[PDB]
PDB file of C-alpha atoms in Angstrom:
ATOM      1  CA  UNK A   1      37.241 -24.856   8.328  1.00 28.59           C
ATOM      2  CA  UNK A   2      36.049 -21.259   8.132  1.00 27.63           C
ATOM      3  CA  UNK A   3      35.455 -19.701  11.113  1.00 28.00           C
ATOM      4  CA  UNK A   4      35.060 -15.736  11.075  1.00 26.43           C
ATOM      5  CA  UNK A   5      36.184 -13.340   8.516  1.00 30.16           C
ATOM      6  CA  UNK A   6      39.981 -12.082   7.910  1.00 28.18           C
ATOM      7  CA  UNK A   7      38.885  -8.391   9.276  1.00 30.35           C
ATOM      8  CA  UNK A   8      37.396  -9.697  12.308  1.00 33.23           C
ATOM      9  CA  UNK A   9      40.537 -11.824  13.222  1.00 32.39           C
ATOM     10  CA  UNK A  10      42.794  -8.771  12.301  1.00 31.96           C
ATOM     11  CA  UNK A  11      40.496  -6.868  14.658  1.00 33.14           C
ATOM     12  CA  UNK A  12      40.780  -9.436  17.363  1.00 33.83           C
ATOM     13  CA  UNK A  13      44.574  -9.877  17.468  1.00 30.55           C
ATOM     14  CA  UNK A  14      44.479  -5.785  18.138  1.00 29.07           C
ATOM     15  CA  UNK A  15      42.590  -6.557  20.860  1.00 26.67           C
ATOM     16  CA  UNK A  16      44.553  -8.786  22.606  1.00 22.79           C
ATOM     17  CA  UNK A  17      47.258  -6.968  22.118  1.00 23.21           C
ATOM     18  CA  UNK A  18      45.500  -3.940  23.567  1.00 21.12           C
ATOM     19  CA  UNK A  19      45.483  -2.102  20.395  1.00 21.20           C
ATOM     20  CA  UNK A  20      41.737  -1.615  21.007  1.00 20.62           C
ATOM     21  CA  UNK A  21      39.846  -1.656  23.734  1.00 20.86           C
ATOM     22  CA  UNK A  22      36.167  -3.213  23.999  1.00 16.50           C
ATOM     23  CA  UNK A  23      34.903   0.311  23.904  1.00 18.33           C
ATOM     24  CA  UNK A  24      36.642   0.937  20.874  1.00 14.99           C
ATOM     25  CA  UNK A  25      34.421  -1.376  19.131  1.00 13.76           C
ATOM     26  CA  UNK A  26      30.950  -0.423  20.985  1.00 13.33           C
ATOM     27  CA  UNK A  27      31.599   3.121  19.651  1.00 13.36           C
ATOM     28  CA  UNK A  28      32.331   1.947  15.753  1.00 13.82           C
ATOM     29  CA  UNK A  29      29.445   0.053  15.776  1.00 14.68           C
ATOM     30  CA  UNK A  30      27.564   2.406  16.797  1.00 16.00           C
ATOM     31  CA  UNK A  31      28.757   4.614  14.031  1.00 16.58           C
ATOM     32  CA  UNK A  32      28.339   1.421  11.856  1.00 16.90           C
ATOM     33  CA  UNK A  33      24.717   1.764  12.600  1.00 16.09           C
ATOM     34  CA  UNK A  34      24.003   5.281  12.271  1.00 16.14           C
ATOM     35  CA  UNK A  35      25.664   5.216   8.946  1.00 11.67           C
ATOM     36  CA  UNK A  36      22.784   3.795   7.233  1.00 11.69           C
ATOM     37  CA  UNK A  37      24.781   1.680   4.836  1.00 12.67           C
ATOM     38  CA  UNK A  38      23.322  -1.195   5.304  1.00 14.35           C
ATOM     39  CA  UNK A  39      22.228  -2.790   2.022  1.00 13.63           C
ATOM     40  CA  UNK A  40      19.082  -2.743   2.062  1.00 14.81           C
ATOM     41  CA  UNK A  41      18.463   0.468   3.641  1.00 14.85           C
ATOM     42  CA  UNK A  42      20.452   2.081   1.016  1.00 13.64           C
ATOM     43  CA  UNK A  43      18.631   0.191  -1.438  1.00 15.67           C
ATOM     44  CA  UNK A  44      15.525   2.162  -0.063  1.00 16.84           C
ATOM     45  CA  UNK A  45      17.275   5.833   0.514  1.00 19.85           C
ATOM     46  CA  UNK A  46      17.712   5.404  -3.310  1.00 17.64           C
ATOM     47  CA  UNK A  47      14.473   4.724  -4.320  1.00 18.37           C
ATOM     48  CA  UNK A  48      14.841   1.428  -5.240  1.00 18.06           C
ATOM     49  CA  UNK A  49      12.540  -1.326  -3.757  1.00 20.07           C
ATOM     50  CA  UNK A  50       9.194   0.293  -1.823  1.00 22.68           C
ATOM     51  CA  UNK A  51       8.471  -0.011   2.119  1.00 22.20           C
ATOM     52  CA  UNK A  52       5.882  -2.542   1.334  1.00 23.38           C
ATOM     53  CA  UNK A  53       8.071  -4.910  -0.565  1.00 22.98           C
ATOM     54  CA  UNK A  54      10.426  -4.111   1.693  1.00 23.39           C
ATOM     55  CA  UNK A  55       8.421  -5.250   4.745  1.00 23.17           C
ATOM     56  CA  UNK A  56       6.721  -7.846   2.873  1.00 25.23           C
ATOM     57  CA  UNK A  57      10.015  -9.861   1.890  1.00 23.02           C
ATOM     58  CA  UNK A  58      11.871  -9.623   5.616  1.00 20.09           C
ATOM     59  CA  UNK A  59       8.843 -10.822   7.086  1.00 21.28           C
ATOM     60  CA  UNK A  60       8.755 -13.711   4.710  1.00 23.85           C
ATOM     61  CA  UNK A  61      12.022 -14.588   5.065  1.00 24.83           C
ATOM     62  CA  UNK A  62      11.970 -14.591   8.685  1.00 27.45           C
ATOM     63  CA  UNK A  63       8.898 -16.404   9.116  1.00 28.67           C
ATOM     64  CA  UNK A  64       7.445 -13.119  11.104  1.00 29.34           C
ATOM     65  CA  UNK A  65       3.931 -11.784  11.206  1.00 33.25           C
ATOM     66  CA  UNK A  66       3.174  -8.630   9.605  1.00 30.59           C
ATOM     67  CA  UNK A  67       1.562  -5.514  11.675  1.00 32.12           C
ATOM     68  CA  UNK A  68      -0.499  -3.230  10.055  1.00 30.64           C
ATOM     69  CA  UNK A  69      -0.711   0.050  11.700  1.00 30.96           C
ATOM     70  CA  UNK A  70      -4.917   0.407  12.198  1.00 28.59           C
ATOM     71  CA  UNK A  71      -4.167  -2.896  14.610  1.00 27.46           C
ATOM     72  CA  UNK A  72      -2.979  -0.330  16.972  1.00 28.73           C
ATOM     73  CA  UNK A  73      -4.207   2.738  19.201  1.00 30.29           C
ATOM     74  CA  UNK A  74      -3.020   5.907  19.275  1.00 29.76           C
ATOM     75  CA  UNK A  75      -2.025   5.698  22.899  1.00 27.68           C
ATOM     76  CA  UNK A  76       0.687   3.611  24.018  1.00 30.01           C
ATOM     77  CA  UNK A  77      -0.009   0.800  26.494  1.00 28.85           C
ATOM     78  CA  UNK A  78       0.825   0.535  30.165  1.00 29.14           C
ATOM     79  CA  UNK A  79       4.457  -1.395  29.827  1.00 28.69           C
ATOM     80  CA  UNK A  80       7.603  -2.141  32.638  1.00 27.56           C
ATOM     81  CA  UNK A  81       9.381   0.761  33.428  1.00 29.16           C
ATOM     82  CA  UNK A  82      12.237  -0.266  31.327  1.00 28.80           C
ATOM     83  CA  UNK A  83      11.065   0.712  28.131  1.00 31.15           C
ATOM     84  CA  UNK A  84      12.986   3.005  29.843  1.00 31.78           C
ATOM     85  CA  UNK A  85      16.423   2.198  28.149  1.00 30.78           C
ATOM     86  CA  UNK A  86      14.480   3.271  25.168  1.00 30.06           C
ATOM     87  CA  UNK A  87      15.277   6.833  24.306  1.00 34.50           C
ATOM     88  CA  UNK A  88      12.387   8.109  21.580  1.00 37.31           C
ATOM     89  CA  UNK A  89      16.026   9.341  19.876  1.00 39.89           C
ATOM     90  CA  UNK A  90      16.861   5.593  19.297  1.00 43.21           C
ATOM     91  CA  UNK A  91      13.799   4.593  18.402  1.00 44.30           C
ATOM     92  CA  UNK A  92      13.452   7.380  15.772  1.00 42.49           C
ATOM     93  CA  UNK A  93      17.033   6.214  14.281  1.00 42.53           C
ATOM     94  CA  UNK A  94      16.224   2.381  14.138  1.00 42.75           C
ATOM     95  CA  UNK A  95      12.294   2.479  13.218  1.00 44.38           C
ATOM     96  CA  UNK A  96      11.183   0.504  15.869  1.00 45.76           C
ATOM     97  CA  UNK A  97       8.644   0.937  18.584  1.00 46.02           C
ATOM     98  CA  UNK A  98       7.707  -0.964  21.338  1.00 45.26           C
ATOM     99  CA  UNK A  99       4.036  -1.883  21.251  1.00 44.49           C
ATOM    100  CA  UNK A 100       2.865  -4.232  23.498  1.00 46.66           C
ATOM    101  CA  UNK A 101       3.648  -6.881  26.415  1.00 44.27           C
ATOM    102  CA  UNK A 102       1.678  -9.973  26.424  1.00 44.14           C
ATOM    103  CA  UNK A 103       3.060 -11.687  28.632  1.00 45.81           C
ATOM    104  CA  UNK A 104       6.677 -11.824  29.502  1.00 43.67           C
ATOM    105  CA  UNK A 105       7.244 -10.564  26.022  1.00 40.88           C
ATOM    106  CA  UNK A 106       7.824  -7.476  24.818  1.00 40.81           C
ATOM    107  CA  UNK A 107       6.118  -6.870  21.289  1.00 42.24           C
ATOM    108  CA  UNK A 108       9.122  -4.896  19.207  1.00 42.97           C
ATOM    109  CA  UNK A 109       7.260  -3.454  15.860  1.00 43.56           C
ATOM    110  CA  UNK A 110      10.477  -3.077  13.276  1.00 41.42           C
ATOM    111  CA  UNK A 111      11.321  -1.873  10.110  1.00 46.25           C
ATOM    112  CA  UNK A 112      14.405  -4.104   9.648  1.00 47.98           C
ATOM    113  CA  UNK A 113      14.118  -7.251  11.661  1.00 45.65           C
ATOM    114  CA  UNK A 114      17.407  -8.659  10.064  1.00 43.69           C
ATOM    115  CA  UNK A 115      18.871  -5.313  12.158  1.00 43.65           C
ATOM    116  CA  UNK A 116      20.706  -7.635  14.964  1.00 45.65           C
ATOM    117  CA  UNK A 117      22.058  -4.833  15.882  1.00 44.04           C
ATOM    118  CA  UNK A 118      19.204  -3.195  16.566  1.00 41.83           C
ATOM    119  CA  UNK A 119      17.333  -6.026  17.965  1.00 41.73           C
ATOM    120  CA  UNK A 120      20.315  -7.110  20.479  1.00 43.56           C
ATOM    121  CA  UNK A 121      20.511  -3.209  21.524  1.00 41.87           C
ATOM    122  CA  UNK A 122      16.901  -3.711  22.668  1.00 42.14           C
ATOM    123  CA  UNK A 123      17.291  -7.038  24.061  1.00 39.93           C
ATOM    124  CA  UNK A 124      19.844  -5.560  26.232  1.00 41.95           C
ATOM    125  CA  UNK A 125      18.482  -2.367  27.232  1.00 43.40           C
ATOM    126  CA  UNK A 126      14.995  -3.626  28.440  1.00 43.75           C
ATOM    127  CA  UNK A 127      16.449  -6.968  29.722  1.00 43.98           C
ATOM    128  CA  UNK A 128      12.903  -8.364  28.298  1.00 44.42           C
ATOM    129  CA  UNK A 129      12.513 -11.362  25.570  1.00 43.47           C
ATOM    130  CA  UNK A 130      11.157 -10.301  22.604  1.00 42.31           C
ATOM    131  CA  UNK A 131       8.541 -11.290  20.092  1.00 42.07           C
ATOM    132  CA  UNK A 132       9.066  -9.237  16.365  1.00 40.77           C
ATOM    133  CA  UNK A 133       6.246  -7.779  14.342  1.00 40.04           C
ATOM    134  CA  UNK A 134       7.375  -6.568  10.919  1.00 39.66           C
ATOM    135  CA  UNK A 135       6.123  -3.062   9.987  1.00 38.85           C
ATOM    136  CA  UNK A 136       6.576  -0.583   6.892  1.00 39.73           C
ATOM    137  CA  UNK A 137       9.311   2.356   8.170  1.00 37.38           C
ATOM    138  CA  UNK A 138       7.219   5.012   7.765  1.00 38.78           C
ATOM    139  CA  UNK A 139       4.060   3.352   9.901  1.00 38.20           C
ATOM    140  CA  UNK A 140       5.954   2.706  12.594  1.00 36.26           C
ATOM    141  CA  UNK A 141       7.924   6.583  11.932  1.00 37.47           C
ATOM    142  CA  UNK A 142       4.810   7.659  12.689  1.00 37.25           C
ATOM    143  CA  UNK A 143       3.661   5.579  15.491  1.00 35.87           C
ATOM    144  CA  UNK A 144       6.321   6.664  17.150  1.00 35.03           C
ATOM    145  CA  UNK A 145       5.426  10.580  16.857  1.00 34.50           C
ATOM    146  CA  UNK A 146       2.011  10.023  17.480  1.00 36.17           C
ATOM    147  CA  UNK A 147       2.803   8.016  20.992  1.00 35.07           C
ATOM    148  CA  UNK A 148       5.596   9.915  21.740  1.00 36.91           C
TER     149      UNK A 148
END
């Protein structure tokens, strides 16, 4: 049956023929990302569907809670060192902010929780779990400022 798309397979056999290397790939992505040309976040750069429906409709899809930004303080809390892995640079670029741990979780407020990208870049860098809130971008834009 299908399996994985034709451009991933082409990009695999260049792989294992060490056409590409591993880093290669972390690099594009990376690009990938900071490209912005996702669908949905181009549908917003032009103007086309608010912040609120925006944030309304991923965290409906998802099945994720909603975070309003007078639920938080205007200090962050006392968190594991390894929020660390968390540049303020990254966080500015994916609009997402760590808010919270309660108890082994890190609370991640984001813009785009659909980002895997994102999320699995945080996942990785704080070695936590996570638990999502949704948030409108420019909330958590400024959040972010205002903590850091």
């Amino acid at each position: 049956m299908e399996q994985r798309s034709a451009e991933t397979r082409i990009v695999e056999a260049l792989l294992e023929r060490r056409r590409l290397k591993d880093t290669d790939l972390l690099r594009a992505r990376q690009l990938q990302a900071e490209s912005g040309m996702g669908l949905l976040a181009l549908l917003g750069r032009l103007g086309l569907v608010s912040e609120r429906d925006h944030a309304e409709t991923c965290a409906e899809v998802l099945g994720l809670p909603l975070v309003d930004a007078r639920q938080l303080g205007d200090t962050p809390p006392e968190m594991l060192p390894e929020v660390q892995g968390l540049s303020l640079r990254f966080l500015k670029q994916f609009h997402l902010c760590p808010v919270g741990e309660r108890d082994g979780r890190l609370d991640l407020w984001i813009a785009d929780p659909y980002d895997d990208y994102a999320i699995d870049a945080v996942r990785l860098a704080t070695g936590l779990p996570l638990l999502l809130h949704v948030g409108l971008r420019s909330e958590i834009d400024d959040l972010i400022e205002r903590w850091y």
